[PDB]
Amino acid sequence: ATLATHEDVTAFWARTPTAEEIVLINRRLAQAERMLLRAIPELLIKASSDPVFRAEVIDIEAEAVLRLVRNHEGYLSETDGNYTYMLQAQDPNRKLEILPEEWEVLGIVRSGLGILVPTVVLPS
Amino acid sequence: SIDPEKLRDQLLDAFENKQNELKSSKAYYDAERRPDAIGLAVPL
């Protein structure tokens, strides 16, 4: 099983999920863990013995799913004529991704200044 | 004292060893190809 759990995603997503949303969350968590491992091969080793690093990766997995399962039906507004709502204009997101600042929390930030080096083979 | 045949051998080897130095000055007077003369920007 993944380091974070559907109980972790439900700790942030105050609405308790239905069984369809539980199977969704279990696969999105597996995708988030698999994405972190491909960037940091040591992830499960660090998380075996560092108890604050466990809290980094678990809350970042739970956030990376939360921003994708929040309002996943895509509704703006709904009614039965006796009750109704409408939402703020949320971004219609379609992929799981981990922020530049979340990679800095995991300790693998990358710089935005790099160099192109001209080269020519020396003669003989 | 010294054998003329061993002396002929030992200094034909010294003569041949000197030619590997002299070629480094011949190459400038004859204007032979040199690695250091090839301008680097020119395509291969």
Q: Between chains, do B40 and A122 touch, taking CB under 8 Å as contact?
A: yes
CA distance B42 to chain A (A): 9
A-chain CB neighbours of B44 within 8 Å are: 121
- Which of A120, A122, A124 has its CB closest to that of B41? A120
Cβ(A2)–Cβ(A30) under 8 Å? yes
What long-range pairs does A16-25 form, CB within 8 A, spacing at least 24? A17/A69, A21/A69, A21/A72, A24/A69, A24/A72, A25/A65, A25/A69
Among all residues of chain B, which has the CA nearest to that of A124?
B35
Give the span between the Cα atoms of B4 and B20, in whole angstroms.
25
Any idea what DSSP says for residue A121?
P
Could you tell me the two tokens for B19? 């030619």
Q: Which of residues 4-43 of B touch A (CB under 8 A)?
A: 35, 38, 40-41
Identify the CA nearest to A69 among candidates A4, A3, A20.
A20
Q: Between chains, do B35 and A120 touch, taking CB under 8 Å as contact?
A: no
**Secondary structure of A53-80 in HEC code, one letter for each residue:** HHHHHHHHHHHHHHHHHCCCCCCCEEEC
Method: cryo-EM
Among all residues of chain B, which has the CA nearest to that of A118?
B41
